[PDB]
Design a protein around this nucleic acid. Structure first.
Ligand SMILES: O=c1ccn([C@@H]2O[C@H](COP(=O)(O)OP(=O)(O)OP(=O)(O)O)[C@@H](O)[C@H]2O)c(=O)[nH]1
Ligand SMILES: [Cl-]
Ligand SMILES: [Cl-]
Ligand SMILES: [Mg+2]
Ligand SMILES: [Mg+2]
Ligand code: NA
Length: 326
DNA sequence: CGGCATACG
DNA sequence: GCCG
């Protein structure tokens, strides 16, 4: 079991779901309390269990597994012995956890904003609606559409949205392409949004593209909210039987030279990308982001034609998106 | 002990 | 919280 999540395949479904969910509760709570380090350890330990080939049944099976020390091992032991971990249950039913979860799940509300509102005494969505002077326009949008945005996006929803994005993209710049990324590219059957990556085969033609896309979508009445730019975090109007629902849609534009890096960077998982960037820097001395891969000694960028190129650059076995579910 | 991913809106 |  290698130490970095990018060094091992992680399927979407696995053999330790209950154990990983418990550890991810503690990771989420650690983040709510400002401890990025503890969040990462608990996320990594959870991901190790996702990568195992069969269920953990005994504590001895944790020996030698990376990122399992006293705390994470204690959590797993209690779950194996009693089917429940007291620390996890205490977090679950704590007012702090439940409110930070409710608040951060809002589009436009992060941990720092949620924490301040918590300290000010706010607890519910109606508490926020009852004081709208304190909200940004983005947060007003996230709060107005909160109910729809709390409904899982389905794979059927994805196909319809890609068609309308392609239509708008085709008018905005003929020959431009739309690639599904994010969790649905990793094989998820549901999601909190739909993520797309847009490019054009002739380097440079993608410049200025996204404003032209957004203006056309807005003209077709399909944009319930959006902000030169190359990323947009929007809320789309998605038709439904006799009605419609709001759906979060992310659009990213990249030049074709950077497309492999942007595809890798936006396909995830979030933990997979963090681990891959950490691996690249700490083990290989290379700086990775969604634009490229930089050698800070030679002051050069690696040219990649594919995700396969990037894995090979970093000396890692290639992992298809479906195996990046760290 | 230091480190913990990344850049755009 | 854990790794090196
Ligand atoms: O903090 C973050 C968030 C996102 N991302 C990058 O953006 C991608 C999309 O980020 P999303 O937030 O849309 O997550 P997701 O598609 O993986 O899962 P859903 O909750 O949407 O179902 C991620 O998969 C990752 O590549 C990061 O690198 N860091
Ligand atoms: Cl590998
Ligand atoms: Cl770390
Ligand atoms: Mg997504
Ligand atoms: Mg997204
Ligand atoms: Na949020």
């Amino acid at each position: 079991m290698p130490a970095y999540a990018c060094q091992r395949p992680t399927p979407l479904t696995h053999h330790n779901t209950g154990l990983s969910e418990a550890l991810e509760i503690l990771a989420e709570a650690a983040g709510f309390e400002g401890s990025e380090g503890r969040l990462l350890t608990f996320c990594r330990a959870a991901s190790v269990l996702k990568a195992l080939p069969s269920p953990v049944t005994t504590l001895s099976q944790l020996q030698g597994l990376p990122h399992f020390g006293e705390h994470s091992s204690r959590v797993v032991q209690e779950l194996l012995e009693h089917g429940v971990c007291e620390e996890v249950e205490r977090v679950r039913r704590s007012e702090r956890y439940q409110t930070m979860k409710l608040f951060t799940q809002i589009f436009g509300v992060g941990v720092k904003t949620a924490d301040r509102w918590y300290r000010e005494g706010l607890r519910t969505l109606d508490d926020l609606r009852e004081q709208p002077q304190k909200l940004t326009q983005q947060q007003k949008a996230g709060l107005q559409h909160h109910q729809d945005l709390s409904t899982p996006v389905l794979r059927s929803d994805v196909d319809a949205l890609q068609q309308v994005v392609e239509e708008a993209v085709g008018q905005a710049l003929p020959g431009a392409t739309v690639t599904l990324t994010g969790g649905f590219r990793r094989g998820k059957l549901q999601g909190h949004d739909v993520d797309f990556l847009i490019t054009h085969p002739k380097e440079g033609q993608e410049a200025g593209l996204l404003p032209r896309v957004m203006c056309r979508l807005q003209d077709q009445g399909l944009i319930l909210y959006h902000q030169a730019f190359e990323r947009s975090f929007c809320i789309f109007r998605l038709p439904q039987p006799g009605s419609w629902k709001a759906v979060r849609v992310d659009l990213v534009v990249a030049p074709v030279s950077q497309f492999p890096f942007a595809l890798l960077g936006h396909t995830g998982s979030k933990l997979f990308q963090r681990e891959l960037r950490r691996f690249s820097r700490k083990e290989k001395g290379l700086w990775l982001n969604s634009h490229g891969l930089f050698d800070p000694e030679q002051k050069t960028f690696f040219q990649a034609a594919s995700e396969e190129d990037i894995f090979r650059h970093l000396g890692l076995e290639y992992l298809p998106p479906e195996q990046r579910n760290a």
